[PDB]
Coordinates of N, CA and C and ligand atoms in Angstrom, one line a residue:
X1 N 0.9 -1.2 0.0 CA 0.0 0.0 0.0 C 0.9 1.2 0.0
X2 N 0.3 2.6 -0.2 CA 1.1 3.8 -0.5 C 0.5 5.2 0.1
X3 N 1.3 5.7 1.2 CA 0.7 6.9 1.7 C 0.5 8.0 0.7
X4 N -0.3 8.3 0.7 CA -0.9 9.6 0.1 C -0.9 11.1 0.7
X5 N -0.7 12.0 0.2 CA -0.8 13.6 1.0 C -2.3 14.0 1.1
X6 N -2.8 14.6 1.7 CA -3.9 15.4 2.2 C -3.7 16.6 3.1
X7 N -4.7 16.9 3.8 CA -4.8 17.8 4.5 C -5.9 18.0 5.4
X8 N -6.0 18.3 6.6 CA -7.0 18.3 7.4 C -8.0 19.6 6.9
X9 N -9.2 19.3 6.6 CA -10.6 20.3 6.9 C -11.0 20.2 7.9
X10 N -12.0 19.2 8.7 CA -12.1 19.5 10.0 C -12.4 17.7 10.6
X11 N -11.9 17.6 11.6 CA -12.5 16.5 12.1 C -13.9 16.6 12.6
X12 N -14.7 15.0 12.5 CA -16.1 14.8 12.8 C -16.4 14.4 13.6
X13 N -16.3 13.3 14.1 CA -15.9 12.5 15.1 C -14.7 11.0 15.2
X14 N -15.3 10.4 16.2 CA -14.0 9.3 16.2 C -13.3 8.4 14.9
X15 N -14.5 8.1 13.7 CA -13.9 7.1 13.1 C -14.5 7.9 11.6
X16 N -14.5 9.3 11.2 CA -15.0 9.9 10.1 C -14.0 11.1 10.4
X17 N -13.6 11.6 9.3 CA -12.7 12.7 9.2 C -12.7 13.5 7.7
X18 N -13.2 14.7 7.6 CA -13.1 15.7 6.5 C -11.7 16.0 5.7
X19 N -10.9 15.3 5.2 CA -10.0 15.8 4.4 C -9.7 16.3 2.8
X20 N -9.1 17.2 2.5 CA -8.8 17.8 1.4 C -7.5 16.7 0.7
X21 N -8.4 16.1 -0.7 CA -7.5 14.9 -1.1 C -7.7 15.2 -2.7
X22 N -6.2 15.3 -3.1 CA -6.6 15.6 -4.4 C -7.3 17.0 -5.0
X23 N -7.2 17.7 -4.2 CA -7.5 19.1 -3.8 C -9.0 19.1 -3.6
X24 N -9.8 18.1 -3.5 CA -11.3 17.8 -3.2 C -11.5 17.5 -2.2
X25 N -12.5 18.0 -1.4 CA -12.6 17.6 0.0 C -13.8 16.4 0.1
X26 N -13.4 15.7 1.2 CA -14.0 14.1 0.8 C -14.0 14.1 2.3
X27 N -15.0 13.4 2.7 CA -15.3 12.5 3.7 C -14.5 11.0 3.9
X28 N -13.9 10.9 4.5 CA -13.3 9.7 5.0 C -13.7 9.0 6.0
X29 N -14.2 7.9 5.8 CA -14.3 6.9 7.3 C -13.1 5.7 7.4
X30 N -12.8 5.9 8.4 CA -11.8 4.9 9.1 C -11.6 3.7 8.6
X31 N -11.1 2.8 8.0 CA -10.8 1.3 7.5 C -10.8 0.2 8.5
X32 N -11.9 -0.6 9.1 CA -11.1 -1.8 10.0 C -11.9 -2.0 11.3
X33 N -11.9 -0.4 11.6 CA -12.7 0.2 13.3 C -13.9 0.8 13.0
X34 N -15.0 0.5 14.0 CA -15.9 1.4 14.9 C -15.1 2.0 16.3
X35 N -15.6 3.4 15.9 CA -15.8 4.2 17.4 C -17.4 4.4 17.5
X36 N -17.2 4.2 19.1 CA -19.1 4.6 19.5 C -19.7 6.1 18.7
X37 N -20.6 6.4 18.6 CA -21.4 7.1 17.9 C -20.9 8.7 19.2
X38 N -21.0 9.5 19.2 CA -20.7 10.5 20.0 C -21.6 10.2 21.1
X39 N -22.9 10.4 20.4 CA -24.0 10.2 21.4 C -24.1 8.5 22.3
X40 N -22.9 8.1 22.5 CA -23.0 6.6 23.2 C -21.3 6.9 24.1
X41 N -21.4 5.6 24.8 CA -20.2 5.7 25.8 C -19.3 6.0 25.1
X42 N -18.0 6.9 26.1 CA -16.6 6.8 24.8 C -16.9 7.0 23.8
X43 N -17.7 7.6 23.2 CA -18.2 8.5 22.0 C -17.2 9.7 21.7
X44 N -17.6 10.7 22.9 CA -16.9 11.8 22.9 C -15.7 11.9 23.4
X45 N -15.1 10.8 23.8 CA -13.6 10.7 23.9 C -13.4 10.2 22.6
X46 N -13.6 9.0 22.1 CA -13.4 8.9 20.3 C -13.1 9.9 19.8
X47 N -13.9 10.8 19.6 CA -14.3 12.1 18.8 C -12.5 13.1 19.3
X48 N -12.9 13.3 20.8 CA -11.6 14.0 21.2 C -10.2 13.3 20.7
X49 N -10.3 11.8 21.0 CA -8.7 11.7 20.8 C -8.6 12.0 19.0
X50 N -9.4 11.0 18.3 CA -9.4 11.5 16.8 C -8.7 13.3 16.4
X51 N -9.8 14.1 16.4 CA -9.4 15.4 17.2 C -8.2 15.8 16.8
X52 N -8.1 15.4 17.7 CA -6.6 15.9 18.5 C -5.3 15.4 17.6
X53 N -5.3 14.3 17.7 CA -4.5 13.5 16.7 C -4.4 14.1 15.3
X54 N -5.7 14.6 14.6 CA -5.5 15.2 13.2 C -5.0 16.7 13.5
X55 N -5.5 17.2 14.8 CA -5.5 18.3 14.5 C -3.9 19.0 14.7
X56 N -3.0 18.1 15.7 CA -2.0 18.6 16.3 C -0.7 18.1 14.8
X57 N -1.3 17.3 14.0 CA -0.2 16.6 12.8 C -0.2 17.7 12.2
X58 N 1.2 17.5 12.2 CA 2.1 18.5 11.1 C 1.7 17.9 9.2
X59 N 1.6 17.2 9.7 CA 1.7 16.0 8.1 C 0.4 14.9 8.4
X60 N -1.1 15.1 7.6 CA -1.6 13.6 7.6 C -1.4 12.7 6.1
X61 N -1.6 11.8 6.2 CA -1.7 11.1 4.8 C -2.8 10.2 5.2
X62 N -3.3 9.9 3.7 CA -4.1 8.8 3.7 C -2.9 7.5 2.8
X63 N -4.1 6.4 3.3 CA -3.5 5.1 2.4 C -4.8 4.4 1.8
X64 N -4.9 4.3 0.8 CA -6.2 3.7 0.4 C -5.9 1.9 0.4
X65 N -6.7 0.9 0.2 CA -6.3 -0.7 0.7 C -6.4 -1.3 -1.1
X66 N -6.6 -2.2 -1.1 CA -7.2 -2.6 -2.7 C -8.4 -3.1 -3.1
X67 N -9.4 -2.6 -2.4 CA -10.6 -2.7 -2.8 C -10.8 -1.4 -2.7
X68 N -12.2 -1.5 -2.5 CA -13.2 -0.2 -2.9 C -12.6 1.0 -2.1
X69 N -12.6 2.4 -2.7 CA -11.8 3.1 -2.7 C -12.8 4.1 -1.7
X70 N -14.6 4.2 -1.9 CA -15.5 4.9 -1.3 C -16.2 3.5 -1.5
X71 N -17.1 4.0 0.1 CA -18.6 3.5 0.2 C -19.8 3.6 -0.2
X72 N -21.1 3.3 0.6 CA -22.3 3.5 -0.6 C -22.8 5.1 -0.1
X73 N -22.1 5.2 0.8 CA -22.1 7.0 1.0 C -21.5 8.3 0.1
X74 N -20.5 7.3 -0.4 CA -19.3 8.4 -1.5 C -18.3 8.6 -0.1
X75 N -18.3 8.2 1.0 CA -17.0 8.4 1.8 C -15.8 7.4 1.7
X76 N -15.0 8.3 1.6 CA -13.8 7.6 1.6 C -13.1 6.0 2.6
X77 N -12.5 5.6 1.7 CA -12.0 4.0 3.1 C -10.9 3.8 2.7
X78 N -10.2 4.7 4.0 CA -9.0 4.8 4.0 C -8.5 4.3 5.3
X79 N -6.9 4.2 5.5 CA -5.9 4.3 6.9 C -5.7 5.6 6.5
X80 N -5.6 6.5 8.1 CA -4.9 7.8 8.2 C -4.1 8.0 9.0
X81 N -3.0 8.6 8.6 CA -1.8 8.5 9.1 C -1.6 10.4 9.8
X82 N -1.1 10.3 11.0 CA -1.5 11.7 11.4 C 0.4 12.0 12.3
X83 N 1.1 12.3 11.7 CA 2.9 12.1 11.7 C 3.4 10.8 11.3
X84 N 2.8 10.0 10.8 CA 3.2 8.5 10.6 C 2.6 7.8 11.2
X85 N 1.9 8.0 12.6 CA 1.0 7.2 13.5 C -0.5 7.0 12.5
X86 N -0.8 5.8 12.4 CA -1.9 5.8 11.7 C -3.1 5.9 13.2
X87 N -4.2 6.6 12.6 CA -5.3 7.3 13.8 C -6.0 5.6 13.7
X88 N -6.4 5.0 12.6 CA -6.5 3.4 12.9 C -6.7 2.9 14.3
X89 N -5.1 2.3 13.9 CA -4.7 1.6 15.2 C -4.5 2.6 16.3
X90 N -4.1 3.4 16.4 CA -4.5 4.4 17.7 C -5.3 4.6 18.5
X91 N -6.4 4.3 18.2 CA -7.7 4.6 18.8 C -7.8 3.0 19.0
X92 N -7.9 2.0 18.6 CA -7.9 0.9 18.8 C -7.0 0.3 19.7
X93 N -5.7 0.5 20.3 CA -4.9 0.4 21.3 C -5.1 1.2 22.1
X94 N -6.2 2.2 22.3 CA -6.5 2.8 23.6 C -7.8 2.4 23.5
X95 N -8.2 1.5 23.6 CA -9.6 0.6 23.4 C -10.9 2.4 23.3
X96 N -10.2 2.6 22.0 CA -11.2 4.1 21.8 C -12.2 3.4 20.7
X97 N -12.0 2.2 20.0 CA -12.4 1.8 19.2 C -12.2 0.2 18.7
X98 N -13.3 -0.6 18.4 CA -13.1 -1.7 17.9 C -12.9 -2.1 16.7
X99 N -12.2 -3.1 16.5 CA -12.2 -3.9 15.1 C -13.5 -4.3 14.5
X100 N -13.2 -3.7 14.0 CA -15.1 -4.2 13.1 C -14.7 -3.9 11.5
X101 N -15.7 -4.3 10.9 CA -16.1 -4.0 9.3 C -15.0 -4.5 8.4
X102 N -14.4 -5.8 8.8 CA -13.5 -6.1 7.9 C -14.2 -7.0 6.8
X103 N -13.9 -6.1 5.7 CA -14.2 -6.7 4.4 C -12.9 -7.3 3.7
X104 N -13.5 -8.5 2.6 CA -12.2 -9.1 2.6 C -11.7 -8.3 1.0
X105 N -10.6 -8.2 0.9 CA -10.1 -7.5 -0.1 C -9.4 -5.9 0.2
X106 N -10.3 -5.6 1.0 CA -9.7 -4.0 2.2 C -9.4 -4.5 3.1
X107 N -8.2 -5.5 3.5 CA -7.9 -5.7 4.9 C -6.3 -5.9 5.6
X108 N -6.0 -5.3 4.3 CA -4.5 -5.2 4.6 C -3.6 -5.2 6.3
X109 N -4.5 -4.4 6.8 CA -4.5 -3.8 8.8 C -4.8 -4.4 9.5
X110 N -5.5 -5.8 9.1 CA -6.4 -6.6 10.2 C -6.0 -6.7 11.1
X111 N -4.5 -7.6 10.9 CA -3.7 -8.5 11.7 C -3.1 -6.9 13.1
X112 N -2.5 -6.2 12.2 CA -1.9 -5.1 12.8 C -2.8 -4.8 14.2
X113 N -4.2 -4.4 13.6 CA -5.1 -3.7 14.5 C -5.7 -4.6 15.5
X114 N -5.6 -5.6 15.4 CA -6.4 -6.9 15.8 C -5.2 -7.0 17.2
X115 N -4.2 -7.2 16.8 CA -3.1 -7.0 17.8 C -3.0 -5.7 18.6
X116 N -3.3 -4.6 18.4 CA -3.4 -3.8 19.3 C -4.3 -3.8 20.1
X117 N -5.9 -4.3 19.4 CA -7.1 -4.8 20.2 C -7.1 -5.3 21.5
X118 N -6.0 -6.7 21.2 CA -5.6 -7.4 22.6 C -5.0 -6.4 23.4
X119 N -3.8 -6.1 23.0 CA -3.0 -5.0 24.4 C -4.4 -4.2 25.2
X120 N -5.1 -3.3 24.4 CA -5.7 -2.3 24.6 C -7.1 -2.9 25.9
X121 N -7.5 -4.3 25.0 CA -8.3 -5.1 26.3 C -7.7 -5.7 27.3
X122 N -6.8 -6.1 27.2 CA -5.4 -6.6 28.0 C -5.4 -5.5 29.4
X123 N -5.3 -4.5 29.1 CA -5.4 -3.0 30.0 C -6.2 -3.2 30.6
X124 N -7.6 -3.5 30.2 CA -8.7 -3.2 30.4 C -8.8 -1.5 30.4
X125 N -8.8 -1.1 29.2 CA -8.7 0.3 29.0 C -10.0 0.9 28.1
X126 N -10.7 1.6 28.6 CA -11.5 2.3 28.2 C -13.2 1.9 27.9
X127 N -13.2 1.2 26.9 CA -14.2 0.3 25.8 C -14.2 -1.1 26.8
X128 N -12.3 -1.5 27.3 CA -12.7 -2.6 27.8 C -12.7 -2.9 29.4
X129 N -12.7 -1.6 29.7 CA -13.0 -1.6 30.9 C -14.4 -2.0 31.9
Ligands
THP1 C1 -15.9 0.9 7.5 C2 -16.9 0.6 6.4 C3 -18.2 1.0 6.5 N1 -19.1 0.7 5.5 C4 -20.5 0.9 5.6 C5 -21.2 -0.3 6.3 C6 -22.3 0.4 7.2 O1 -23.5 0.4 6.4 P1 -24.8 0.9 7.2 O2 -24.8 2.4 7.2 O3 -25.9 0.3 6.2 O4 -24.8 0.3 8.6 C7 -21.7 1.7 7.5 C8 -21.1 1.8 8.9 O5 -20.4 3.0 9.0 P2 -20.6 3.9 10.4 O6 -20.0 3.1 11.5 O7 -19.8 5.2 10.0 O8 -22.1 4.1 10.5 O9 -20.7 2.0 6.5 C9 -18.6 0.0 4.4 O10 -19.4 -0.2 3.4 N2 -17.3 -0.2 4.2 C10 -16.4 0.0 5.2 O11 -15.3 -0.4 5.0
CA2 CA1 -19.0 4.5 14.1

């Protein structure tokens, strides 16, 4: 796979992010993970750490997988990379978010994120507290 340049517009919440790609601004949802909905537990921490993470990167990039590139929304399905840290697995090693929605063909991260899952419940941190 191959990081791509972007640029932050604004973050949305935990597992959706507004970026300027291709000089078009697109909706991105997260590849791999659910974060709770805002309005649910650890919602609004999702939302903050996401946030924070786009907002404080000097440099984000996307990585697109090799399937489908957008959903039946027109949003983007990507990994985003916010200094090199992909926000992914980030949020998923601070049990901010679960592994979910792995489709086969976009799943390059599984293994990756799947492994941080454990540490993060391991903790009993957050989600798995
Ligand atoms: C992450 C992801 C979500 N989606 C779709 C499935 C879900 O459809 P439904 O809207 O019919 O539930 C929805 C979940 O996203 P959200 O968690 O942002 O709601 O987005 C994909 O099609 N591909 C993906 O890789
Ligand atoms: Ca969600």
């Amino acid at each position: 796979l191959h990081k791509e340049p972007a640029t932050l517009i604004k973050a949305i919440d935990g597992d959706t992010v507004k970026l300027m790609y291709k000089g078009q601004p697109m909706t991105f949802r997260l590849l791999l993970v659910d974060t709770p909905e805002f309005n649910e537990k650890y919602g609004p921490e999702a939302s903050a750490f996401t946030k924070k993470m786009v907002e404080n990167a000097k440099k984000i990039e996307v990585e697109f997988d090799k399937g489908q590139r957008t959903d039946k929304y027109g949003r983007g399905l990507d990994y985003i990379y916010a200094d090199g840290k992909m926000v992914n697995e980030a949020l998923v090693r601070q049990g901010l978010a679960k592994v979910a929605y792995v489709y086969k063909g976009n799943n390059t991260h599984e293994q990756l994120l799947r492994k941080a899952e454990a540490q993060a419940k391991k903790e009993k941190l957050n989600i798995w507290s």
